[PDB]
Design a protein around this ligand. Structure first.
Ligand code: MG
Ligand code: MG
Ligand code: MG
Ligand code: MG
Ligand code: MG
Ligand code: MG
Ligand code: MG
Ligand code: MG
Ligand code: MG
Ligand code: MG
Ligand code: MG
Ligand code: MG
Ligand code: MG
Ligand code: MG
Ligand code: MG
Ligand code: MG
Ligand code: MG
Ligand code: MG
Ligand code: MG
Ligand code: MG
Ligand code: MG
Ligand code: MG
Ligand code: MG
Ligand code: MG
Ligand code: MG
Ligand code: MG
Ligand code: MG
Ligand code: MG
Ligand code: MG
Ligand code: MG
Ligand code: MG
Lengths: 187, 104, 176, 49, 159
RNA sequence: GUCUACGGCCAUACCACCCUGAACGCGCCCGAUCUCGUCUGAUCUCGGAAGCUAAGCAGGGUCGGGCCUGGUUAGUACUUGGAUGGGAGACCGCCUGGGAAUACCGGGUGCUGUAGGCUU
RNA sequence: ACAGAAACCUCCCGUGGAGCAGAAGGGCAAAAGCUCGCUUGAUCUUGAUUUUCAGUACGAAUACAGACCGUGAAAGCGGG
RNA sequence: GCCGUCGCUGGCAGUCGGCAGAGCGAGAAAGAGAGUGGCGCGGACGCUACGCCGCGACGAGUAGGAGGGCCGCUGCGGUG
RNA sequence: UGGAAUGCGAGUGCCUAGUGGGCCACUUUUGGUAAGCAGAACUGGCGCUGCGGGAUGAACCGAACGCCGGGUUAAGGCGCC
RNA sequence: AGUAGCUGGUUCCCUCCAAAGUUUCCCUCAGGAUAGCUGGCGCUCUCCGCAGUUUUAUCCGGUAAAGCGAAUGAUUAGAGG
RNA sequence: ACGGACCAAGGAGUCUAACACGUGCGCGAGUCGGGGGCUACGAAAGCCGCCGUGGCGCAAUGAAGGUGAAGGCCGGCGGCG
């Protein structure tokens, strides 16, 4: 007998996409090869994000892509997101962008192209940037989901700003006892 | 009927399955709970930091010039050692050629 | 200590570790009887600790070596002074043996103390071992062999090859 | 570099001692096997290697 | 069961040492405590204000807040399988500067001095500590004196 | 050599008794108009300067008590970890490490910071 | 003097052997006790923390911060 | 020796053939680099990439959880 | 000169079942004359666990388990069974 | 098809991980909620950090032992005044 | 300790609703026609767009009346100084 624990032997991590999409799996075949046969860590990161689930691939808005592609030294670099590029109506002017994405919404496509930009697919990124050179890999906000408002210390604990689960919002819905000192206590 | 009352038996075994972890440490600790009067001034100190911005630029550039100026003005066995030299892929590259030339 | 096999006699020399107070602490020597030298050093630290403010941590062994029997071909009488714990006390004994080696005599003492008093080796402290002249021996078991014309037969010699053959036709003869 | 060269070596998988033991449950100086037996480890290593 | 009393079991913990009662020496109040200081907490029964709870007696923490009379200390406390960083407000009678780091700060300066000095002499000097090594070979002089023979003493009933 | 004011550590400084205290100090001391407080100018407060080290205070002494610190007690008592050790038990021994406290014996008897004096 | 075992007056010793509401433990001597003088910090207010703890509530308690105040010559101390 | 699990988030698109040239496992970064001046007609298998291959460690299990079943039953759309 | 040794990849987040009768042993330990009694601390067990030994046996001693061959052992044994 | 914190039953295989009988609250004591213990899904990094360990410094403690010609409490014998 | 003499066949976590999280797909600051209407399998499928009413989301906060989500620099003037 060997003195060892086995509860952590199996690592919980995706080796492939749960999706049965045949176009996504053709891109995984592509980047499985590039990640294996090139020393480029960029390929490994993209291969990993192709396995990732829907909530681990948040959409990247147009306004946020412009901000991150406007930092100094990022001129003529292709912005890359393994996800969806959504349009942002709060933007007034779109610059000339070169972007690679899994999906670009219909209105984001017109605005990027109308500014003189180029929209790639990941099979076109490989031919243009086999090792990922001259790229800017970008991610959407992962905690930008309604669930993360409900996580943390339970709402009924001191200095807990977690959001409760209420069927309705209003004066009659979880506001008397425990939420104001006038009714029992507050914390 | 009567039953057992209390025990901590088996409890340290449970606590250690996922380890008794020490509290997480971050380089910046929150200012919660510090003296309100002290904190009020620390916010006033931070608020007007930009007033002396130009003086810092002047002093920093002045210090850099002086710092650069001074710097610019300022600036086992013989057999086993020989063999270890020859076996070195770079250093012994010419020493190895001499043996090969000699051998032929 | 287990009195395993025939014991050896070890000369163990030790001292306190030198310190600024006493750069040259005095040297101490003991006679140790043990199965191996590793046990011999262990028992030394057990004895000196009972006589001095010393122990393995605050002292060192300076010399451990086996003392060889000096006349292994001469029969001698050995007196042994020992103390031991019984089930209900401690006692001092004086005992005698005839042997060619002093470590052989000490081994006989351990077997004998085990046979006649059910005393385990861990409860026995051999204080002193001397070679004694025939005229100074006290125990009649030893003195009866101080006879220049000693003679005696070997009555009733038991068959020790009792399974070679296991079955025979003739019955054994015990007289020779 | 004893630390590095020694961590490099996998723990040695030794066989059961051929010829037996004395008493694994007590110290070597008690006639057993546990503890520090000093140079006498080499005899043990011969029978297990 | 036991009571949940705040000072239960501190009969000896908070009492004053033998013949050390009475006035508190005033150097207890002149110590300077800054943010980041390591201090050992030791409740003192003479002053009943700003007393640390018994569980914090004998623990060491870091100062994070300084008021007119007390300091805020971040001190670890183990409760079942977790260790919480607890913030306690203790009057400065019940703390003292810890020496646990002074040996370290002494070594840093010695380290920083030696590192600098050795560098300008082009030499290498050990900086890391080491565990005490096995003693090395040496000679022990007899001085023509045989070691004193020791024997076990006979048993004597000194009852 | 030493003192005064204010101290830090808080008997190695305390307690008891005895001896000696140059100079400057600190005192005792002499008064009650004023300030101030008392049954009482004893204390407290105030105004002084004839006398004295008698006392406080300082230094020293005592086969001194205490206190401080060593030795012994003692590798003892106790103790971590070990055994298919002993013993009916009570308990004890051994292995691996740590390791006390009385009685008894010796030594010591304040150090020192800031400022200001005295002491050819 | 009456006056005694015990009344009141005086000197001396006194490390607390008393007292501090109460159970006990801790603490306390130019004080935390006793006696006087003045008073209402036992008032108004937001947060933080501790104890029990699930790191919830209550209760109790601890450092502060802002007002008004008391006291003292003052440093300060006091929100039972 | 064999089975499975886990790990190496290991290797294989290079089956690059007469429009040919067979290698990249080896102690120690980065090119089997490109150039400018001084007769036969031949060469196994592989690759359902959800595939195939290599190396190392590991394997108790109630309550309970999860995975995989080219395990089994009835019916429906397709297909054979 | 990443400032002791040794070993080891870590951090983090959601959702979550069963459980919430335990019992035993070394040592410590309360009540009790004591109990295979009742009640605690520590660690390890049995519960959930087979296997060699203690004839037999929840817990003792050894040792923990994929299906096999060879070798060697532990605790225990070697008159015959 | 009344309710049942209670009794009884609860149907194929292999593979991997693997408990609790404890905390607090409850007209709570054959039951729940709660934390702990489990599993699953991952994800963020890696090929500095951490540790049921020691080492070196540094604090904390009033049990074992001891003491009572040391305080409190209990207690035997004489001796000198 | 309780159930089980034997054989066959039947025999126990389902469906509706609500919620939470995880995963897959579509579109994306939007999204959804579910109700309605138009035009054998077919009670299907297709369509509507001045049928998007309406739900959820895009804004929170307060009991409420209500309010409801960055600044700095330069130049000029008025006031205080
Ligand atoms: Mg195994
Ligand atoms: Mg397992
Ligand atoms: Mg229970
Ligand atoms: Mg053999
Ligand atoms: Mg054992
Ligand atoms: Mg004079
Ligand atoms: Mg007068
Ligand atoms: Mg005098
Ligand atoms: Mg004396
Ligand atoms: Mg003096
Ligand atoms: Mg007073
Ligand atoms: Mg205030
Ligand atoms: Mg298994
Ligand atoms: Mg019991
Ligand atoms: Mg059970
Ligand atoms: Mg288990
Ligand atoms: Mg088992
Ligand atoms: Mg039996
Ligand atoms: Mg076998
Ligand atoms: Mg047998
Ligand atoms: Mg019915
Ligand atoms: Mg019930
Ligand atoms: Mg697991
Ligand atoms: Mg109730
Ligand atoms: Mg039942
Ligand atoms: Mg106690
Ligand atoms: Mg005792
Ligand atoms: Mg029944
Ligand atoms: Mg029946
Ligand atoms: Mg979803
Ligand atoms: Mg029809």
């Amino acid at each position: 007998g060997v003195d060892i624990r086995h509860n952590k032997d199996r690592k919980v991590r995706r080796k492939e996409p749960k999706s049965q999409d045949i176009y996504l799996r053709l891109l995984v075949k592509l980047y499985r090869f590039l990640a294996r046969r090139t020393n480029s860590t960029f390929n490994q990161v993209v291969l990993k994000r192709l396995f990732m689930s829907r909530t681990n691939r948040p959409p990247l808005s147009l306004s946020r892509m412009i901000r991150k592609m406007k930092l100094p030294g990022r001129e003529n670099k292709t912005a890359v997101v393994v996800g969806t590029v959504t349009d942002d109506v709060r933007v007034q002017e779109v610059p000339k962008l070169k972007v690679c994405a899994l999906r670009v919404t219909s209105r984001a496509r017109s605005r990027i192209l109308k500014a003189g930009g180029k929209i790639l697919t990941f099979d076109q990124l490989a031919l243009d940037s086999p090792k990922g050179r001259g790229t800017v890999l970008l991610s959407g906000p992962r905690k930008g989901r309604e669930v993360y408002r409900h996580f943390g210390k339970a709402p009924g604990t001191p200095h807990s700003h977690t959001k409760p689960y209420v069927r309705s919002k209003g004066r009659k819905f979880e506001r008397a006892r425990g939420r104001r000192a006038s009714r029992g206590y507050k914390n | 009927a009567k039953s057992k009352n209390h025990t901590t038996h088996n409890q340290s075994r449970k606590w250690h399955r996922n380890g008794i972890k020490k509290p997480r440490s971050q380089r910046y600790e929150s200012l919660k709970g510090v003296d309100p009067k002290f904190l009020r001034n620390m916010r006033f100190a931070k608020k007007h930091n930009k007033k002396g911005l130009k003086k810092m630029q002047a002093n920093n550039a002045k210090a850099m010039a002086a710092r650069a100026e001074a710097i610019k003005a300022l600036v086992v066995s013989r057999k086993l050692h020989r063999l270890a030299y020859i076996a070195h892929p770079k250093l012994g590259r010419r020493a190895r050629a001499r043996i090969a030339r000699g051998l032929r | 200590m287990k009195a395993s096999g025939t014991l050896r006699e070890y000369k163990v020399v030790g001292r306190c570790l030198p310190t600024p107070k006493c750069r040259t602490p005095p040297l101490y020597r003991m006679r140790i009887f043990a199965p191996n030298h590793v046990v011999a050093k262990s028992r030394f630290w057990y004895f000196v600790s009972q006589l001095k403010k010393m122990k393995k941590s605050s002292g060192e062994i300076v010399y451990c070596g086996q003392v060889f029997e000096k006349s292994p071909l001469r029969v001698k009488n050995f007196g042994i002074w020992l103390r031991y714990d019984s089930r209900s006390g401690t006692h001092n004994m004086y005992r005698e043996y005839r042997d060619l080696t002093t470590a052989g005599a000490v081994t006989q003492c351990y077997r004998d103390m085990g046979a006649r008093h059910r005393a385990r080796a861990h409860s026995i402290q051999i204080m002193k071992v001397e070679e004694i002249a025939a005229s100074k021996c006290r125990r009649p078991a030893v003195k009866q062999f101080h006879d220049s014309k000693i003679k005696f037969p070997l009555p009733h010699r038991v068959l020790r090859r009792q399974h070679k053959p296991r079955f025979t036709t003739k019955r054994p003869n015990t007289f020779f | 570099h004893f630390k590095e060269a020694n961590n490099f070596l996998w723990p040695f998988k030794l066989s059961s001692p051929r010829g037996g033991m004395k008493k694994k449950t007590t110290h070597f100086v008690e006639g057993g096997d546990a503890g520090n037996r000093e140079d006498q480890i080499n005899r043990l290593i011969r029978r297990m290697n | 069961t036991n009571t949940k009393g705040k000072r239960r079991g501190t009969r000896y913990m908070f009492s004053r040492p033998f013949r050390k009662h009475g006035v508190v020496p005033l150097a207890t109040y002149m110590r300077i405590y800054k943010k980041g200081d390591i201090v050992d907490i030791k409740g003192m029964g003479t002053v009943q204000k700003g007393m640390p709870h018994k569980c914090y007696h004998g623990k060491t923490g870091r100062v994070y807040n300084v008021t007119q009379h007390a300091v805020g200390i971040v001190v670890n406390k183990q409760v079942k399988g977790k260790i919480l960083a607890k913030r306690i407000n203790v009057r400065i009678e019940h703390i003292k500067h810890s020496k646990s780091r002074d040996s370290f700060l002494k070594r840093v300066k010695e380290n920083d001095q030696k590192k600098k000095e050795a560098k300008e002499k082009g030499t290498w000097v050990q900086l890391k500590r080491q565990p005490a090594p096995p003693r090395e070979a040496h000679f022990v002089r007899t001085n023509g004196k045989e070691p004193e023979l020791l024997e076990p003493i006979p048993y004597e009933f000194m009852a």
